[PDB]
Amino acid sequence: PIVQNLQGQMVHQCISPRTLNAWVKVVEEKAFSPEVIPMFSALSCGATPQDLNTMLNTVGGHQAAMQMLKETINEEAAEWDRLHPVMREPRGSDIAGTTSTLQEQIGWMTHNPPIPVGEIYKRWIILGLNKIVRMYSPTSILDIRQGPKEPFRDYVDRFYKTLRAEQASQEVKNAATETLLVQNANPDCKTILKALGPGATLEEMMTACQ
Amino acid sequence: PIVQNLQGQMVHQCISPRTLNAWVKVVEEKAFSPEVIPMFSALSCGATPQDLNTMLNTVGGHQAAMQMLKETINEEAAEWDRLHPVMREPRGSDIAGTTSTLQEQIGWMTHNPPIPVGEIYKRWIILGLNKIVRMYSPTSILDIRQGPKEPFRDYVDRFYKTLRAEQASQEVKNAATETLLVQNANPDCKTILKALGPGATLEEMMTACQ
Amino acid sequence: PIVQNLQGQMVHQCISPRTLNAWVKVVEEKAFSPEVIPMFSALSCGATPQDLNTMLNTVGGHQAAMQMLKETINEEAAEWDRLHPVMREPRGSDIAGTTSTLQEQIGWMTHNPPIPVGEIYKRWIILGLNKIVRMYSPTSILDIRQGPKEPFRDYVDRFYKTLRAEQASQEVKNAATETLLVQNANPDCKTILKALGPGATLEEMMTACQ
Amino acid sequence: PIVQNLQGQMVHQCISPRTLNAWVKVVEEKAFSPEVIPMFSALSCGATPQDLNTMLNTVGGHQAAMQMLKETINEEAAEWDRLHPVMREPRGSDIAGTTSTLQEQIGWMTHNPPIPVGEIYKRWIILGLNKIVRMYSPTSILDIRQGPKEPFRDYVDRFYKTLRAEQASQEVKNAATETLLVQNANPDCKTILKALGPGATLEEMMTACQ
Amino acid sequence: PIVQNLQGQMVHQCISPRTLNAWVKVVEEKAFSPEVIPMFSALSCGATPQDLNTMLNTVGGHQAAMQMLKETINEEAAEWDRLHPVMREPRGSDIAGTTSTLQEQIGWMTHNPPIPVGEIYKRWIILGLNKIVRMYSPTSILDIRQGPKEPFRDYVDRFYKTLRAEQASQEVKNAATETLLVQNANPDCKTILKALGPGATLEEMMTACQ
Amino acid sequence: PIVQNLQGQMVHQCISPRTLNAWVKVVEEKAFSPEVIPMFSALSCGATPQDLNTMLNTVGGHQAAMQMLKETINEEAAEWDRLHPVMREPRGSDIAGTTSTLQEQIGWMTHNPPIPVGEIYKRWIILGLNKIVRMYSPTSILDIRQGPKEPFRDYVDRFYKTLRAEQASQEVKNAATETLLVQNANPDCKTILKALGPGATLEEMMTACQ
């Protein structure tokens, strides 16, 4: 990835074994849980398209997901080529890092103004990963219900984990979300939440059901 | 996080995978014990709101706590907007890192005088974490007493651990707290402490009951 | 390898023990899976031919594969010698790091215009590794068929992993490959895929068969 | 901690996760053995009071020890305030790191002449740690006596470890301690040591009694 | 070892603990398999004679091998003294690292032109290690015969591993080597090798014997 | 330890936790085997007396050995004081690091001409460690005997390991050493060794009995 040196300029540096190990271990252990995407966005700080290609190709399993990612990147490159018809300006395949040289990528990312091919490739990969995570949700939100003896903490944590997996975003707060949350609880906490009144925060609901 | 180079200028640095792994392991293994807050304040030395959001979103489980944290940050941002009506001035959401880009944050944190958006966001996150840790107390302070044969050392350890968890702070010393400690002590140690009289430090009580 | 310091010139630095340990661990663990080649291209970023020889000779086991690699490198060196009739210009063996000193390799890797002996040797080694990986595939692509109760997701995983093993590249799918994919599926999923019609993406096939 | 950069200036640096993990592991595993204090003085080299507070607060267990440490710090700060009647001059709490900011601490630590607030706070913490270590001695010195078949080396190891714990120092050997050491030895070794006469060092005693 | 700094000169650096740990672990775990020599030549890149002595004296076991290494080094030093009749010019014992100081070694390795005492010492140590590796071959190559149900790949693995051990070098290719390889195979593969015809490469033999 | 910065000057640096962890682990695991002294020499590269004291105090067990080391240090300091009757020149105590501040030590180790208190202190510590390792020898050299069927390799390994321990030095080859080596060999090997002829090298003996 491109970093900043002590002279004050952007100079390319090789990708480190630590970053590669971190990414491979994360993908192998956490599978495609929703928090992998922030991990991908953090490990790819200032990455060139070649670095992102290395990170994607290094993954051993989940080849169906990687094929979906490849198809999504191709679709995004086609859309970019349609929206941007014609140093040489980049094309979709050049941004994808399959028809361009590392030197050209570094020249683009250091140009004034910069042409962040790495950022665009990261956005395409992030769209692909969002689709993959949304497809790999283990269960639907409508089937999350508190057990007969399950504490409110466990039920709420499972409900919000599922709702993060489904919508592919942690920020899943909605009025219908709260209604579904209160509906699926056990009757003991259901009555308390019903009597708590509208507009209550999740903190107050957890305190009341503690 | 913004760091200082050998030249002597504040520049951005990519967030290291080592810090991310440390924070993830700490949250996974420490649950929400009161010692997590100093760890978060240490790992985030000089971080920007983007880095804080990365560190928060990378947490795997405990989604209810993250939702409470998000709601608390929203409340604090609303309060900040109310107290500050209207480079572009940072709004509550911009400080929270929802509608802000990296360049804007770095310009804010390198301005003269600096607008410490990172510090403000860290304060809001610290408030949310304090509330979460307080909520995560396994038992109240009034429910802990020394056992029939428990050494006074372990009893004081448990008492002060519970006291730290209850108030989400370590410095919770009070005359009422000392009276509670001597009240719940074993009858032999209670008699010894009563004979020792008021004004005795914790060290003297520990020495006497040895 | 050769890296750039703050003075502004390429300088040679010793190969770090971290890279060597990572490469040895990768070879010992993953055997010759198709993802070894991206790891080799990543760990050897800017490595002079001496470093490539160090990385190749450090591998303990799999001596047949290393002998095939040696023969392939010799053949490529002979072709290079034939195509290039005769600072001294490099030869095939000089590029292969057998009859060249470290100083000569540094000079070749740093002149203007550069003679990327490291990159040429890397391409030869990657060709040899492609041959090895293609030879080491456990199964043929015609032996992959979905089981009576195996999910379509796992069937696609196996199919595309084996396909990457054979062609030694991720870009291995084709129209005939898509026909093979739909033909080898279980009849229940085969009917759905047939009803989905031509032009269907892998995403739609995965969604429909669930 | 404040460290000297390559340009030759004393600049503030964030405290690395490795030091924090090392200190946490040392406290967690070694309890409060006498060797912890040298580890504390080595890990916290050049630290400002904020870093010392972070390193103290990060400890999870042993809350009674931390309470005693806080009491000792308060006593020493009161003494400092008494002895110093009144850039702004530091106070007891300012040195302790509770009513001071990072900028003020850095200014004090880098003023000419320096006001070593970090060193003074470290001395107070060392006093507290010495008190805790002395309190946490499992056994008294007089209770170390050689077994019927116990080797002399292990007996001397136990004796000197116990003596090290008590006086909160390693250089605790003395003529009275030498007499105590020769008193509790086994009669077979006791007669040999008595015949060896005064003036014999520990090496000669160990050699004679093997 | 000696490295290159940002000032552009050659200056000394202490041998890092990671290098020492890597060397000790490699030597202990891998015994004296032929891949140790590439590891030794990679870890000691640019090492001074004192660094080589530190790396050799740190090994715990295999003391007979270390004594043979010392004998070989002494013989080579005597030869060097014989071949060179007589800042002081180096002698055999100075390159051996027994009668030279670190300052003198650095002056030798940084003189104009450099007198690579480190490289000469490393060559002597490599000759000694080659002798030890040859002596540590578990079995003779003539006893390697393919099993009744052993795959030809595993037979080639064992054959070439043993042959590399015997010569302490990877260059074991020969017409007699190929004849010995084909003679020891099972008749089922021996007939196929005979039918393949002379002059075939190893890859063709592997593919035809599958 | 005092190291050289990029500007080209000697400045102090806090002892890194990696060095301390390595030193403590080695001392705890290997006990006082003769290979510890090279490790201590490597890890203490360029250290001040304060760093040497830090590394000595951090050792938890084996307090008898540490007391012997302290006695040896005191004796050497007394000898230094006698040999050198009285920036202030360093006395024995100041060299030992008990009565000298870090500023004085840095001023001493960076003066022109240098006064290497660290080197002298390391010499004293190495003398003490040699004495400790010599005392800690598990067995005598005369008791080293070959088993009836124990391979000659293991016999020579044990013999030279013990003889290295016996004299606290690896350079232990001698005429009497070889005489005892051939005297304690098994009769089957003794016949071959006797018929081999005087003056034979160790490699010839190993090959003859292999």
- Structural contact between residues A62 and C157, judged by C-beta atoms closer than 8 angstroms: yes
The helix/strand/coil state of D13 is coil
DSSP class per residue in A8-42: SSEEE-PPPHHHHHHHHHHHHHHTT-TTHHHHHHH
Say what the alpha-carbon torsion angle E4, E116, E20, E137 is, to the nearest 10 degrees: 140
For residue B17, list chain A residues with Cβ-Cβ distance below 8 A: 18-19, 22, 42-43
Query: A135–C43: do the CB atoms touch at under 8 Å?
Result: no
Taking chain B, what is the end-to-end CA distance rounded to the nearest angstrom? 49
In chain E, residues preceding a discontinuity (C to N beyond 2.5 A) are 86
Q: Hey, what are F169's tokens?
A: 């030095």
Which candidate, E172, E22, A179, places its Cα nearest to that of C21?
A: E22
d(CA A131, CA C166): 28
Which of C5, C21, C70 is opposite residue E6, by nearest beta carbon?
C5
A82, A106, A140: which is the final residue of a domain? A140
**F59: which DSSP letter?**
-
Nearest 5°: the CA angle D195, D196, D200 is 155
Q: Do both A61 and A93 map to the same domain?
A: yes
d(CA C3, CA C17): 16
d(CA D14, CA D36): 23
Which candidate, D63, D71, D67, D120, places its Cα nearest to that of D97?
A: D120
The helix/strand/coil state of E133 is helix
Collect all residues from F whose CB is shorter than 8 A from any CB in D: 5-7, 9, 11-15, 17-18, 20-21, 54, 57-64, 66-68, 70-71, 131, 135
**Amino acid identity of F201?**
T
d(CA B105, CA B85): 20
**E35: which DSSP letter?**
T
Helices and strands (DSSP H and E) totals, chain B: 11, 2
- Structural contact between residues D161 and F65, judged by C-beta atoms closer than 8 angstroms: no
- Structural contact between residues B61 and A161, judged by C-beta atoms closer than 8 angstroms: yes
The helix/strand/coil state of D69 is helix
d(CA D7, CA F6): 8
Q: Do both E85 and E174 map to the same domain?
A: no
**Shortest CA distance from C8: residue in chain A:** A7
**D45 phi and psi angles, rounded to 5 deg:** -70, 125
Q: Do both B167 and B111 map to the same domain?
A: no
Q: Hey, what are C193's tokens?
A: 């895929």
| Cross-strand pairs, E174 | none
- Structural contact between residues D70 and B202, judged by C-beta atoms closer than 8 angstroms: no
Q: Which residue has the tokens 């000469």?
A: E120
Q: How many CA atoms lie within 13 A of F160 on its CB side?
A: 23
d(CA C78, CA C75): 5
Largest CA distance in chain D: 68
**Shortest CA distance from F17: residue in chain E:** E17
**Amino acid identity of F29?**
E
Which candidate, F101, F92, F123, F108, places its Cα nearest to that of F2?
A: F108
Collect all residues from D whose CB is shorter than 8 A from any CB in B: 5-7, 9, 11-15, 17-18, 20-21, 54, 57-64, 66-68, 70-71, 131, 135
- Structural contact between residues D2 and D13, judged by C-beta atoms closer than 8 angstroms: yes
**A199: which DSSP letter?**
T
B108, B140, B172: which is the final residue of a domain? B140
Alpha helices in E31-116 (DSSP H): 36-43, 49-57, 63-83, 92-95, 102-109
3-state secondary structure chain C: CEEECCCCCEEECCCCHHHHHHHHHHHHHHCCCCCHHHHHHHHCCCCCHHHHHHHHHCCCCCHHHHHHHHHHHHHHHHHHHHHCCCCCCCCHHHHCCCCCCHHHHHHHCCCCCCCCHHHHHHHHHHHHHHHHHHHCCCCCHHHCCCCCCCCHHHHHHHHHHHHHHHHCCCCCCCHHHHHHHHHCCCHHHHHHHHHHCCCCCHHHHHHHHC
**A31 phi and psi angles, rounded to 5 deg:** 60, -125
- For F94, the enclosing helix (H) or strand (E) is helix F92-96
Which of E30, E160, E173 is opposite residue C64, by nearest beta carbon?
E160
**Shortest CA distance from B5: residue in chain D:** D5
DSSP class per residue in B121-178: HHHHHHHHHHHHHHHT-SS-GGG----SS--HHHHHHHHHHHHHHHHTSS----HHHH
Size of interface B-D (CB pairs under 8 A): 74
Which of C20, C64, C70 is opposite residue E156, by nearest beta carbon?
C64
Q: Do both B11 and B62 map to the same domain?
A: yes
**Amino acid identity of B176?**
A
Say what the alpha-carbon torsion angle C61, C67, C72, C73 is, to the nearest 10 degrees: 80
For residue C153, list chain A residues with Cβ-Cβ distance below 8 A: 64
Instruction: Give buried/exposed letters for D8-22 (b at 16+ CB in 10 A, else e).
Output: eeebbebbbbebbbb
| Cross-strand pairs, B11 | B3
**Length of chain C, in residues:** 210
In chain C, residues preceding a discontinuity (C to N beyond 2.5 A) are 86
For residue B58, list chain A residues with Cβ-Cβ distance below 8 A: 35, 38-39, 42
Question: Taking the alpha carbons of A197, A201, A202, A204 in that order, is the dihedral positive or negative?
Answer: negative
For residue E6, list chain F residues with Cβ-Cβ distance below 8 A: 6
Q: Do both E38 and E96 map to the same domain?
A: yes
Query: At what angle are helices C36-43 and A17-30 packed, to 10 degrees?
Result: 150
Q: Do both B167 and B207 map to the same domain?
A: yes
Which of D3, D156, D170 is opposite residue F57, by nearest beta carbon?
D170
F140, F171, F194: which is the final residue of a domain? F140
Distances, alpha carbon D137 to alpha carbons B153, B205, D32, D161, E21, in Å:
13, 17, 9, 10, 35
Q: Which residue has the tokens 């604090």?
A: B76
Query: E61–F161: do the CB atoms touch at under 8 Å?
Result: yes
Residue E73 CB neighbours (<10 A): 22
Q: Do chains F and E touch (3 or more CB pairs under 8 A)?
A: yes
The helix/strand/coil state of D209 is coil
Which candidate, B208, B209, B11, places its Cα nearest to that of B109?
A: B11
- Structural contact between residues B127 and B72, judged by C-beta atoms closer than 8 angstroms: yes
Which candidate, F93, F22, F33, places its Cα nearest to that of F59?
A: F22
Instruction: Give buried/exposed letters for B6-34 (b at 16+ CB in 10 A, else e).
Output: beeeeebebbbbebbbbbbebbeeeebbb
**E144: which DSSP letter?**
-
- Structural contact between residues D189 and D150, judged by C-beta atoms closer than 8 angstroms: no
Resolution (A): 3.3
**F82 phi and psi angles, rounded to 5 deg:** -65, -45
Q: Do chains F and D touch (3 or more CB pairs under 8 A)?
A: yes
Distances, alpha carbon F194 to alpha carbons B14, F179, F182, in Å:
70, 11, 8
The residues, any chain, with a CB within 8 Å of residue A142's CB and separated by 6 or more, are A180
Which candidate, B122, B86, B117, places its Cα nearest to that of B103?
A: B117
Which candidate, D131, D123, D112, places its Cα nearest to that of D47?
A: D123
The helix/strand/coil state of E118 is helix
Q: Do both E132 and E163 map to the same domain?
A: no
d(CA E61, CA F165): 12
d(CA E163, CA E171): 9
d(CA B43, CA B39): 6
d(CA F16, CA E16): 11
- Structural contact between residues D210 and D171, judged by C-beta atoms closer than 8 angstroms: no
Q: Which chains touch D (3 or more CB pairs under 8 A)?
A: B, F
Q: Which residue has the tokens 């293991």?
A: F154
d(CA A115, CA E75): 64
Whether omega for the bond prior to residue D187 falls within 30 degrees of 0, making it cis, is: no
d(CA D193, CA D210): 12
Q: Do chains A and C touch (3 or more CB pairs under 8 A)?
A: yes
**D171: which DSSP letter?**
-
The residues, any chain, with a CB within 8 Å of residue E30's CB and separated by 6 or more, are C60, E36, E39
Whether omega for the bond prior to residue C113 falls within 30 degrees of 0, making it cis, is: yes
Instruction: Give buried/exposed letters for A71-91 (b at 16+ CB in 10 A, else e).
Output: bbbeebbeebeeeeeeeeebe
d(CA D92, CA D115): 13
**Shortest CA distance from D158: residue in chain F:** F63
Query: E157–C62: do the CB atoms touch at under 8 Å?
Result: yes
Q: Do both E177 and E130 map to the same domain?
A: no
**Length of chain E, in residues:** 210
Q: Hey, what are A41's tokens?
A: 């966005």
| Cross-strand pairs, B3 | B11
d(CA B140, CA C75): 77
Whether omega for the bond prior to residue F113 falls within 30 degrees of 0, making it cis, is: yes
d(CA C125, CA C118): 10
d(CA B11, CA D83): 43
Q: Hey, what are F107's tokens?
A: 């001023």
**B88: which DSSP letter?**
P
Which candidate, B14, C44, B101, B97, places its Cα nearest to that of A44?
A: B14
**Beta strands at B10-11 and F10-11: parallel, antiparallel or unpaired:** unpaired
Q: Which CATH number covers residue D11?
A: 1.10.375.10
Q: Do both E131 and E146 map to the same domain?
A: no
Whether omega for the bond prior to residue A113 falls within 30 degrees of 0, making it cis, is: yes
Q: Do both F129 and F161 map to the same domain?
A: no
Q: Which residue has the tokens 């601490």?
A: D105
Q: Shortest Cα distance from C186 to chain E (angstroms)?
A: 31
Q: Do both B152 and B206 map to the same domain?
A: yes
**Shortest CA distance from C138: residue in chain E:** E210
Q: Which CATH number covers residue D194?
A: 1.10.1200.30
Strands annotated E in chain E: 2-4, 10-12
Collect all residues from E whose CB is shorter than 8 A from any CB in F: 5-7, 9, 11-15, 17-18, 20-21, 54, 57-64, 66-68, 70-71, 131, 135
d(CA E155, CA B147): 69
DSSP class per residue in A48-107: -HHHHHHHHHT--S-HHHHHHHHHHHHHHHHHHHHHS---PPP-HHHHTTSSS-HHHHHH
d(CA E71, CA B156): 65
Q: How many domains is chain F built from? A: 2
Give me the domain span that covers residue F99. 1-140
Which candidate, C46, C75, C70, places its Cα nearest to that of C56?
A: C70
Q: Do both C154 and C117 map to the same domain?
A: no
